[PDB]
Design a protein around this ligand. Structure first.
Ligand SMILES: [Mg+2]
Ligand SMILES: [Zn+2]
Length: 337
């Protein structure tokens, strides 16, 4: 007698379950569903009712066993003072202006952070989702993680340069970013999110050295996971093998990883008992192009490999067909006959 909610939480914590849940902890907005239910980007980023409507659509039509919102990695950084290009129907919002590119004078978490930007759109959409689906479906709150938030406060160019030349500034930014991150994450929990999933691409070995991850980044990610009042998941895009074992020490229940790093079996060997593994079906090379049977085959492989929560490896590409998302769920059902 698991519910979708109780199973997800049990899975992520490593407690026994009847079967692996199938859902996404990464963004679920797809153009096919934007068209069906009339909730296109960018308006689905700015209006809580359309945000709700599109999230629910990739639950109710796809069979993914959670509702995930929002669709972008800019809500918090914008509330922190970044300027955002809101993008288009298939191009996600992106940061164009950084509030503290040359120094951190005056940089703080604003006392009224939660009223700023689109924070109130996300909190309201969570409440709308909860009211519609009820207590037995889990709500995953997505956000940019503290490394990426720090990098957006100061520009990635300043962030990289300070990492070598002004580590005090690097650390001050990381500290403000972590504080803001915890505040927003807890707000999503208070609004009704069951899992907080952070996406922190700047922490990737593709952008920051593994040595820098261990020296500066790990401690902030540890502080986040410890201070946030829910089950959490850490997603770091890219070739994360050189830090996978360090990720597993950060205190997140789950780690969300891309197909790129190898098999689920291999990932489980690295992380051991320290965290669970969420993933890993390739968003750009399997889920987006299909075909359906290739998605089911790679799903099956992750399940056999011991994945804890079957999911896309990264955010779903916006042009992913609905039937390709449904092929994930079908693979899971098939595994259990
Ligand atoms: Mg397991
Ligand atoms: Zn990713």
């Amino acid at each position: 007698e698991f519910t979708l909610k109780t199973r997800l939480l049990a899975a992520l914590k490593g407690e026994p379950v009847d079967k692996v849940p199938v859902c996404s902890v990464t963004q679920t907005g797809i153009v096919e569903l934007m068209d069906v239910v009339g909730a296109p980007w960018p308006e689905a980023h700015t209006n809580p009712e359309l945000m709700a409507k599109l999230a629910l659509a990739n639950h109710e039509l796809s069979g993914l066993e959670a509702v995930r919102l929002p669709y972008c990695l800019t809500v918090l950084v914008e509330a922190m003072g970044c300027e955002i290009n809101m993008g288009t129907k298939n191009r996600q919002p992106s940061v164009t202006g950084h509030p503290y590119p040359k120094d951190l004078e005056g940089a703080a978490v604003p006392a009224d952070l939660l009223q700023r930007g689109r924070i109130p759109v996300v909190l309201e959409a969570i409440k709308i989702i909860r009211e519609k689906v009820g207590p037995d479906v889990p709500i995953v709150g997505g956000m940019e993680g503290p490394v990426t938030v720090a990098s957006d406060l100061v520009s990635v160019k300043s962030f990289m340069k300070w990492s070598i030349k002004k580590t005090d500034l690097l650390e001050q930014a990381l500290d403000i970013a972590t504080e803001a991150s915890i505040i927003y994450a807890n707000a999503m929990v208070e609004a009704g999110a069951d899992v907080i999933a952070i996406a922190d691409p700047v922490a990737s070995p593709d952008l920051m050295s593994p040595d820098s991850f261990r020296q500066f980044l790990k401690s902030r990610l540890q502080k986040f996971a410890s201070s946030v009042n829910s089950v959490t998941v850490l997603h770091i895009c890219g070739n994360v093998n050189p830090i996978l074992s360090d990720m597993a020490d950060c205190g997140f229940e789950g780690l969300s990883v891309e197909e790129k790093i190898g098999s689920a079996k291999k990932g489980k060997e690295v992380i051991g008992t320290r965290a669970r593994l969420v993933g890993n079906v390739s968003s750009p090379f399997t889920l987006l192009p299909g075909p359906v049977d290739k998605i089911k085959a790679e799903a099956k492989e992750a399940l056999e490999g011991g994945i804890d929560v079957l999911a896309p490896g990264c955010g779903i590409a916006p042009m992913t067909p609905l039937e390709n998302v449904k092929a994930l769920v079908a693979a899971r059902d098939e595994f259990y006959a």
